[PDB]
C-alpha cells in the first residue's frame, strides 16, 4: 500500500481574510453583490445576522467559505435624509452614531436617496430642495411623488424654506 | 451522473456492420435513442431504463452531465464541435397543453405531412447546423405522422505540422498485443485542444474491430509512449450510408410496434415509428481533419489502416472507421 | 478485501497511474484509471477555471490545493463546490475518473462496506477580479498611489463609490493629493458635501478653485451656500466682498449668476 | 407581475428570479428570450452557449448560489432590450416519482438615453 503526503500548501490571502476590520468595506455594497470574506463559521453568524438584517448569508465554497449577500437596502429616514453625510450609521443602545461600535446594529442608507424621494414626505413636516433637478432616475414611482411635492410647495408658498425656493426657482 | 453506457450503444451499432467502407458515427446514433426517453411512458419507459442501466430515480440529472459535455467540447476556435436537435409533430396530433410550453423552444415544430413535407423537413436542417440534404425523396408515405433528426459536425487541426507522406517527428508510439496479434498504434494529437486522431495498421481487421470499445480504447491510448518515430499517412476520402432497423429490435422493440407503443405523455392517441437511416462522411487534408455526420429516424426512405477520433478525458467517442 | 497492489505507471504521463484494485471476488477485479499530481500549474487548465488532480476531501484543510498554483498570480482565484469526486483513503488527493466497467454504484458499495475511498469535491478555481486586504490597503490603492495588487473595481479611476467612505476623511485631513481631484471628477454628491466643508474652513487654497470648476456645475446650491458661510465670519478676504455678503481672475468666490451677465 | 428592473446605458443589467419550494431539486436552469431564442443555457458552473454568444456579452455571476439564478449582461444594446424568459426546470427527489415543473417568471428591461 503506497502512502503519499500532500505537498506544502500555499496559504493565499483568501484564507487570512477576516470578517472584522471589514466594516468600512462591507457597508459599501450594492444590491446582489457578493463581498468575499474569509471562512465564516457559526460562531459569529447570529451576531452578524442581527448586525446585518439586510444580508442573507449563503454558502459559497468548501469549509464554510461564505459571503454576505445584500438583498434589501432601506434608508431609515429618521436619520439619513436629515444628516446628509451619514451613508451608514449605527444604533448603539438606541442612539445614532458615526463610528463603528460593537453590538450596535449596522444600517446604511439608500444610494443617492435624494434621487429617489423616499424622505420627501418626512422632510415636509437648501439641502433636499437642490435635489429637484438631479431627479434623473426617471422612475415612475418617484416622478409622481415629485410633481405632488412640487404642486404642494407652489401652492403653500403662494398663500424660510419657501423663501429659499424662490431663489432656487431660476432655472431648476 | 454517468454517460458511461451511452457511448457504448453507438459502439455496438458499429459492431453489427459487415462491410469494408465505414465512417460510422456512434455519437449521432446514441443521442437520438437516449433522449427519446421523453415521450416514452408506461411500458416503453421501463424498457429503455433497463437498457442503459439507468435507475428510474436517476432520470433528470442525466441531462445535466450531457449539457456539461456539450459545452466542454467547445474550448477554442481552431478546433471545436457542434450539435443540434430537431423533431416534428403533425397538426392533427393532439398535443397536450403542458408540452406546448414545457419544451416549446427545444423543438416539436408543427407541420402537415401531406403538403410538401419533404421541403418542410429540408428548411429546418440547414438553419440548425451545416448539414446539406440529409433527407431523401422516398422518406415518406401515407402513414407518416412523426419525425426526429440529429446532427454532428467536426473540425480539427494537427499538433505537429506535416513535414503516402512520410514525416520524421518526435511522437508517442509502441506495439500492442491484443491476443496473439501485433499492431503499432500511433497517436496523432491535435493543437490547442484535447482531442486527436489515432492510427493502426494490421492484417486481420476482424480481430481488431470486434473489440473496439471506449473502455478498452483508453487502455490502448496510454501504452503509447514518447520516442522518435517515422510514420506514413496518405490523403483520401471515405463514405458510408446504411440502415439501423435490423439492429434495433433488441433494445426498444415496442416503439416500432403500433400495439405496444406506450407514448402517453406527448400525446394520448396511438403513434409508432417504422425505420431509421444514417449518412456519415469524413474528409482528410494536410492541415488537419474534417468530419461530419447526421441521422434520421423516420417511416421509410490487404493490410489497410484504421482511423479513430477520440476525446482525451470526457470519453465521447466521435466518428470511427477504416480506410 | 483488496489484494492487488500494481500501480502500473504509464509512459505518456508520469501522473497517469493505474491502481489495479484486485479484490478477492472475481467481479470485484478492476484496474481504475486515476492520476496524481506533481506539476506547477502556472498555465491554464480550462478557460476560466483550473482542474488539478487533487480530489479534495471534506473535513480537511482547504490549503492543500492552493499549493500547486504559482503565486504572484494566484491572488485572483477563489474556490467553489466542485463536482462529487472520490479519492483514496491511502492516497490523499488521488482523483479517480469514471470509465470502463467501473460504476458509481460499484464504488459506492465498495466504500460503504470498506473505507478505502474518501468522499469530497474536486478542487475548482474560478477567475474574477482581485480581492481586497484590510482597511490600510483601502487607504493605499484607493488613494491612487499604488495602482496594483487590488481589484480594478477600486482602481477604476474613481468610477464606483465603494472606496468613497474612507478617502472622504483622508481628503478632509489633507486636500494635498491630486488624486483627491480625480475623485472629485467622479461626479458624486457625498464627496462634494464633505470636502466643501473643508473648503469652507480654508478658502484661500487653490484646491477650492478647481472644486468650483469640476463638481459645482452639477450641484450649485450646496457649494454656493457653504461659500457664503465662510465669508460671513471671515471678512478679511479681499475678493469675497464683491457683490457678496459684505457688500476677473477667479470665480471660485462667487455664485453662478454673476459671471453669466458679464 | 414582477416589477421591471430597469438599468441605464451599458451597465450591469442584473436580472433575477426566485423559486417557491426549497426542498425540490433543480435539474437545470436556462435563460431564454421570448418567444424562442435560448440566449444561453447553463448548469452548475458550466455554461453552454447557443448560436452567437460567448463570455464577452453574458456571464454567469451566480455560479455558487443555487437559490436564484442571475445574469450580468455587459455593454447593453438595443438588441438586448427585450422580454426575458427565466426558467427553473424542476423535479422532486424525495422518492421515485414522475413529475415535471416548469416555473417561469418573465421580466422586462428597458434601455433609453
Ligand atoms: C486541454 O486543452 C487545453 C487547450 O485547449 C490545454 O491548455 C493549454 O495548455 C498549453 C500548455 O500548458 C498552453 O500552451 C502554452 O500556453 C501559454 C499561453 O499562455 C498561458 O498562460 C497564461 C498565464 O497568464 C497568467 O497571468 C494572466 C495575467 O497576466 C492571467 O490571466 C492567467 O490566468 C495566468 O495567471 C494564460 O493567461 C494563458 O491562457 C495560457 O494558459 C504559452 O506558454 C504558450 O504560447 C502556449 O500557448 C495553452 O495556452 C493552454 N490553453 C489553450 C487554450 O491552448 C489543457 O492543458 C488541456 N487539459 C488537459 C491536458 O488536462
Ligand atoms: C481474425 O481472427 C479471428 C480469431 O478468432 C477470434 O479470436 C479468438 C481468440 C477467439 O475468441 C475466437 O472465438 C474469435 O472469433 C477469426 O475468428 C477471424 O476469422 C479472423 N478474421 C478473418 C477475416 O478471417
Ligand atoms: C408558493 O408560494 C405561495 C405564495 O406565498 C404560498 O402560498 C405557497 O404555500 C407556496 N407553495 C409551497 C411553499 O409549496
Ligand atoms: C424514497 O423511497 C425509495 C424507494 O421508492 C427509497 O429507496 C429511498 O431511500 C426513499 N427516500 C427517503 C429519503 O426515505
Coordinates of C-alpha atoms in Angstrom, one line a residue, chain C residues 94-216:
Chain C
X94 CA -5.9 11.0 -5.7
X95 CA -8.6 11.6 -8.3
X96 CA -10.4 8.6 -9.9
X97 CA -12.1 9.0 -13.3
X98 CA -15.2 7.2 -14.4
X99 CA -14.5 4.8 -17.2
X100 CA -14.5 1.1 -18.1
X101 CA -16.9 -1.2 -16.2
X102 CA -16.3 0.9 -13.0
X103 CA -19.6 2.5 -11.9
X104 CA -20.5 4.9 -9.1
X105 CA -22.8 2.2 -7.7
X106 CA -20.0 -0.3 -7.6
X107 CA -17.6 2.0 -5.9
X108 CA -20.3 3.3 -3.5
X109 CA -20.8 -0.3 -2.3
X110 CA -17.0 -0.6 -2.1
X111 CA -16.5 2.5 0.1
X112 CA -19.6 1.8 2.2
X113 CA -18.5 -1.7 3.0
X114 CA -14.8 -0.9 3.4
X115 CA -13.4 2.6 3.5
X116 CA -10.6 3.0 1.0
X117 CA -12.4 5.8 -0.8
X118 CA -12.6 9.4 0.6
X119 CA -15.6 11.4 -0.4
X120 CA -15.3 15.0 -1.4
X121 CA -15.4 17.5 -4.3
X122 CA -12.7 18.3 -6.8
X123 CA -10.7 21.4 -6.2
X124 CA -12.1 24.0 -8.6
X125 CA -10.7 27.5 -9.1
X126 CA -12.7 30.4 -10.6
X127 CA -11.1 33.6 -12.0
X128 CA -12.5 37.0 -11.1
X129 CA -11.2 40.5 -10.3
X130 CA -8.6 40.8 -7.5
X131 CA -9.6 40.7 -3.8
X132 CA -9.1 43.2 -1.0
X133 CA -6.9 43.2 2.1
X134 CA -7.6 45.4 5.1
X135 CA -8.5 49.0 5.9
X136 CA -4.9 50.1 5.4
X137 CA -4.9 48.6 1.9
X138 CA -8.1 50.5 1.3
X139 CA -6.2 53.7 2.3
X140 CA -3.3 52.8 0.0
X141 CA -4.6 51.9 -3.5
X142 CA -7.9 53.8 -3.5
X143 CA -5.8 57.0 -3.0
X144 CA -4.2 56.2 -6.4
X145 CA -0.6 55.8 -5.1
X146 CA -0.1 52.0 -5.7
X147 CA -2.4 51.2 -8.6
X148 CA -1.7 47.5 -8.4
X149 CA -2.5 44.4 -6.3
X150 CA -6.0 45.4 -5.5
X151 CA -9.3 45.0 -7.5
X152 CA -9.7 47.1 -10.6
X153 CA -13.2 48.0 -9.3
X154 CA -11.3 50.1 -6.8
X155 CA -8.6 51.1 -9.3
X156 CA -11.2 52.2 -11.9
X157 CA -10.1 55.9 -11.8
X158 CA -12.8 56.6 -9.2
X159 CA -15.7 55.1 -11.2
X160 CA -17.6 53.2 -8.4
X161 CA -18.3 54.5 -4.9
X162 CA -17.2 51.6 -2.7
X163 CA -14.0 53.4 -1.5
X164 CA -15.8 56.8 -1.2
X165 CA -16.1 56.4 2.5
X166 CA -12.5 56.4 3.7
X167 CA -10.8 58.9 1.4
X168 CA -13.5 61.4 2.3
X169 CA -11.9 61.6 5.7
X170 CA -8.4 61.4 4.2
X171 CA -9.1 64.4 1.9
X172 CA -10.6 66.2 4.9
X173 CA -7.3 65.9 6.8
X174 CA -5.2 66.8 3.7
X175 CA -6.5 68.1 0.3
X176 CA -2.9 68.0 -0.9
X177 CA -3.1 64.8 -3.0
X178 CA -4.1 65.5 -6.7
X179 CA -5.8 62.1 -6.6
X180 CA -8.4 63.8 -4.5
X181 CA -9.2 66.0 -7.5
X182 CA -9.6 62.9 -9.7
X183 CA -12.1 61.6 -7.1
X184 CA -13.8 65.0 -7.4
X185 CA -14.2 64.3 -11.1
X186 CA -16.0 61.1 -10.1
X187 CA -19.2 63.2 -10.0
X188 CA -20.7 62.2 -6.7
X189 CA -22.7 64.3 -4.2
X190 CA -21.5 63.0 -0.7
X191 CA -17.9 63.7 -1.7
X192 CA -18.7 67.2 -2.6
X193 CA -20.6 67.9 0.6
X194 CA -17.9 66.6 2.9
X195 CA -14.9 68.3 1.3
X196 CA -16.7 71.6 0.7
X197 CA -16.9 71.9 4.5
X198 CA -13.1 71.8 4.4
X199 CA -13.2 74.3 1.6
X200 CA -15.5 76.5 3.8
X201 CA -12.9 76.3 6.6
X202 CA -9.9 77.4 4.4
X203 CA -10.8 79.1 1.0
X204 CA -7.6 80.8 0.0
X205 CA -6.0 77.5 -1.1
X206 CA -6.0 76.8 -4.8
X207 CA -7.7 73.4 -4.2
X208 CA -11.1 75.2 -3.8
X209 CA -10.6 76.8 -7.2
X210 CA -10.8 73.6 -9.3
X211 CA -13.5 72.4 -6.9
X212 CA -15.7 75.1 -8.4
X213 CA -14.7 74.1 -11.9
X214 CA -15.3 70.4 -11.5
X215 CA -18.3 69.4 -9.4
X216 CA -20.1 72.7 -8.7

